[PDB]
Every structure is written in structure tokens, then in C-alpha cells.
Amino acid sequence: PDSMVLLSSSWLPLNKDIEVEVVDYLPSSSVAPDLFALTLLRINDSSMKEKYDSMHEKMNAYAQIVPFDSELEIGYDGVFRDAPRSVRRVRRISATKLYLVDFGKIINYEKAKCFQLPKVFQSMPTRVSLCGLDGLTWSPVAIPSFDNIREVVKKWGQMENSTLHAMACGFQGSINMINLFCGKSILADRLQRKGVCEYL
Amino acid sequence: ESLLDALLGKAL
């Protein structure tokens, strides 16, 4: 049978300021219903840049891209080939959607363009980082707004005309517990100020 | 009222 592949995700450095882009939400079984989760893509990280760029070069040149006997199972990983020598790593996050785990973009599931992820390309974690907003107890009435809040947060850096920064405060399973901020504008502080959540 | 305030206000 086909091997069911699930890439781990990139860790953020503890108590270290990093530059991040808020990307499309990658769901994880490791997020509690009342944890405000979000997906970050650390940017301007030269250490990993050459590694990811090298991976994509080899993936595009890879000869032995094999198809699934059956198909990519939901929740698991393979590759998406949108054209010859254009190959990227994906997770089938739902029946109709793939997630480009190294770019932070959701695209439509195309059965014919999906192939297995070769073992040699399973060593790099997803470039995106699974994250959760640290230090908060959310009002139950607010939890339904998490999607809307994520959309706002995705555009926050653009509206600030600034690169957002993050700092991992800890780790809960596979989730980076982070603060997200732009200068003195701290996400948890502005949410807490609206009374939809309280500090732990 | 910050910029992010306004953003969050519409989401809520």
C-alpha cells in the first residue's frame, strides 16, 4: 500500500525575535478548540533558505515521481506537480484542498497532479510553523470568531506596512506558543483589550 | 484606538 507521510513542522526559536508572514491556516490535530491557532512562515532566515531552495531544485529535477496506487489520503502529504519540473510538497488538508506546506498557500486538490513524496524529500520539516496565541483564555462566545480574526491577522502586516515579528514563548506538543507583534502593537494585548479573552 | 483595534473590531 501507499506509505502515509506526515511531515513535521518548523520550530520557532525560544524567546528569539523572528520576522514572520502570517499565511493560510494549516489545521492540526494538536490545537484545542479554545486555542486561537495560526500558521506563520518565518522569513529572511538564511540558514534554512539554501536548504529549502536546494530541495525545490532537486524536486523539480527528480526523475522518479511515482503516483499513488489509490490517492493522497486526507491529512497526509505528497507532492503537487502543476507542470513538468514544477514540484512542491503538499498536505491534503481536506477533500477538495491541498496545502503547500513550504509556502503557506491553499490550492485546489487535483487528483491527476498529486504524486507520492519521495523519502529523500521527507527530511525537511514543513517551512510553515504550527502556532498558537499564547497566554489567553478565550470567551466561549468569541471562539466562533477565530476564522474572522485569522483573516484580520493575515492582513495586519500589510495594514501596518511593516513586517510582523513573533517570539516563541513555549511549545505545546507540535504547536509553537507565540507572541505576535508589530513594534509596541501586541496581538494578545489588543484582543484582551476587547474583552473577548483574558490572560492566563 | 490602534490600527489593529479597528481590524479586530470588524472581525468581531
Numbering used by the authors:
A (entry chain A): 115 to 314
B (entry chain B): 85 to 96
Sentences reproduced from the published study:
If PUCH cleaves PETISCO-bound precursors, interactions between the two complexes may be expected. Using a combination of pull-down and size-exclusion chromatography experiments, we narrowed down the interaction to a region upstream of the TOFU-1 SLFN domain (residues 82–172, TOFU-1N) and to the extended TUDOR (eTUDOR) domain of the PETISCO subunit TOFU-6 (TOFU-6eTUDOR). AlphaFold predictions showed two helices in the N-terminal part of TOFU-1, and a construct containing only the first helix (residues 82–113, TOFU-1pep) was sufficient to bind to TOFU-6eTUDOR. Quantitative analysis with the minimal TOFU-1pep using isothermal titration calorimetry revealed a Kd of around 20 μM. We determined the crystal structure of the TOFU-6eTUDOR–TOFU-1pep complex at a resolution of 2.2 Å. On the basis of the interaction interface, we designed mutations in both TOFU-1pep and TOFU-6eTUDOR that should disrupt their interaction and tested these using pull-downs and size-exclusion chromatography. Whereas mutations on only one of the partners (especially TOFU-1pep) weakened the interaction, mutation of both partners fully disrupted the interaction. We next tested the same mutations in vivo, using CRISPR–Cas9-mediated mutagenesis of the endogenous loci. Sequencing of piRNAs and their precursors from both single and double mutants revealed a reduction in mature piRNAs, as well as an accumulation of precursors. We conclude that piRNA accumulation in vivo is stimulated by the interaction between PETISCO and PUCH.
Here, we identify an endoribonuclease, precursor of 21U RNA 5′-end cleavage holoenzyme (PUCH), that initiates piRNA processing in the nematode Caenorhabditis elegans. Genetic and biochemical studies show that PUCH, a trimer of Schlafen-like-domain proteins (SLFL proteins), executes 5′-end piRNA precursor cleavage. We also demonstrate how PUCH interacts with PETISCO, a complex that binds to piRNA precursors, and that this interaction enhances piRNA production in vivo.
